[PDB]
Design a binder for these strands. Structure first.
Ligand code: MG
Ligand code: MG
Length: 137
RNA sequence: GUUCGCGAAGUAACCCUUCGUGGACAUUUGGUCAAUUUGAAACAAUACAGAGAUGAUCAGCAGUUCCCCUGCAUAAGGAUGAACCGUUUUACAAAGAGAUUUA
């Protein structure tokens, strides 16, 4: 397959033209947005990946799996702070979803950082959430 | 250049001519733009094919697109105008069983 810069180049251009055709006709079909982001990571170019996710949110934000994978896409490259700000935008966009709060917790427990998880459960309780929040706190 | 006025000289007899001087009349055009190759019409010819739903031969309407063309057109046509017809793994768990390691 690939030889040098120039071949890699053509191999990219072709893919991007193809996909974004297929996204051009379906704004929806989230899976497509995901896969295209995934390819974008495998090219070791993040900036584009960030965007591609963001666009994918501007279409639909209620679709959590995209939130999640746009987290893990930030973590698996071992860049955290992005995966924090993203979390503030996440739970703030959707407080009623547990999966976001729990995932942001685990992100702060595997980092051992407590001060957070204290103030964190302080919020996630302050909204009078439900039985499982208190129980887990 | 005109006209009014003054002064001078000459003609003169308050004028005709010349000179000097004062005043009045008249007042800012045009460029988004330089003169064929290097700041962009689009075709044609040649070659190759030779029309979507089917097992086959065809009528068509649409639908989406950061594609348009002809048309005065919010009419209607342009192969049903064309493109589409492909690639695809994670909100992730529960229970049972054997094996490995260990407080
Ligand atoms: Mg038509
Ligand atoms: Mg059509």
């Amino acid at each position: 397959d690939i030889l040098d810069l120039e071949e890699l180049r053509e191999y990219q251009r072709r893919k991007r033209t193809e996909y974004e055709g297929y996204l051009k006709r379906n704004r929806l079909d989230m899976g497509q947005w995901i896969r295209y982001a995934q390819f974008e990571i495998e090219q070791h170019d993040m900036r584009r990946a960030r965007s591609i996710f963001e666009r994918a949110l501007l279409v639909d934000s209620s679709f959590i799996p995209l939130w999640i994978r746009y987290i893990d896409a930030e973590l698996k490259v071992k860049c955290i702070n992005h995966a924090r700000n993203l979390m503030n935008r996440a739970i703030s966009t959707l407080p009623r979803v547990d999966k976001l709060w729990y995932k942001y917790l685990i992100v702060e427990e595997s980092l051992n950082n407590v001060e957070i998880v204290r103030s964190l459960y302080t919020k996630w309780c302050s909204l009078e959430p439900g039985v499982n929040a208190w129980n887990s706190f």
